[PDB]
Design a protein around this ligand. Structure first.
Ligand SMILES: [Fe+3]
Length: 222
């Protein structure tokens, strides 16, 4: 079983991913760890990539893509979930041609739908209990709305991390995702539009009841 998953920052994508690869026993291949296996453990491609990195440059796709495929072959031999790559349409199209050339089928693409404005807001609405950071508090998600200026769960003092209030970096990351011309949503639409031709199933998830979404999906797989 081979899955792609797409979703903006603050859609709980990593969470849904995790739930999926547990239930179906898949290897969660994330775009960061690909470069670690390579650029760390020094593969032929890692070595060539690091020359670009060490210069202030991004890796070109004809290095990036072969790398993604090598990780999928070796770590993904029994089923994989790809999160975070492809970020764009040039990458998406190249990825898909590379996949066909190596005969790896996609079985499901998953897209977590969520409006730009609502996504920013779940990032910004997110407060951390000082007693236990796992205690989920969010001004903008009702189910988990905090209790005054203190933790919904245990009533400890809760603060904001200022990476969550960095509208600079959040909008840069979202300008890329919600880019329907050639960015991440364009990458997902590209797959959506060939789902039937290629015979994979494309699953849309309403990103706005954390565990009623976790079985709109569990239901739709195998
Ligand atoms: Fe707490």
């Amino acid at each position: 079983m081979n899955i792609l998953i797409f979703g903006p920052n603050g859609s709980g994508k990593g969470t849904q991913g995790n739930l999926v690869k547990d239930k179906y026993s898949l290897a969660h291949i994330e775009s960061g760890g690909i470069f670690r296996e390579h650029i760390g453990g020094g593969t032929e491609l890692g070595k060539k990539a690091k020359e670009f990195i060490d210069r202030g440059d991004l890796v070109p796709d004809d290095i990036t893509i072969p790398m993604v495929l090598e990780t999928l072959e070796s770590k993904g031999k029994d089923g994989w979930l790809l999160d975070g790559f492809p970020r764009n349409t040039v990458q998406a199209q190249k990825l898909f041609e590379a996949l066909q050339e190596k005969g790896m089928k996609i079985n499901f693409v998953i897209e977590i739908l969520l409006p730009r404005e609502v996504a920013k807001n779940r990032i910004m609405g997110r407060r951390i209990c000082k007693n236990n950071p796992n205690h989920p508090n969010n001004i903008f998600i009702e189910a988990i709305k905090p209790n005054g200026d203190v933790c919904r769960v245990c009533g400890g003092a809760l603060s904001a991390r200022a990476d969550d209030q960095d509208e600079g970096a959040i909008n840069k990351r979202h300008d890329i995702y919600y880019n329907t011309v050639d960015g991440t949503l364009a990458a997902a639409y590209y797959y959506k539009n060939m789902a039937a031709k290629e015979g994979f199933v494309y699953i849309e998830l309403d990103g706005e009841s954390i565990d009623s979404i976790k079985d709109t999906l569990l239901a739709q797989l195998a």
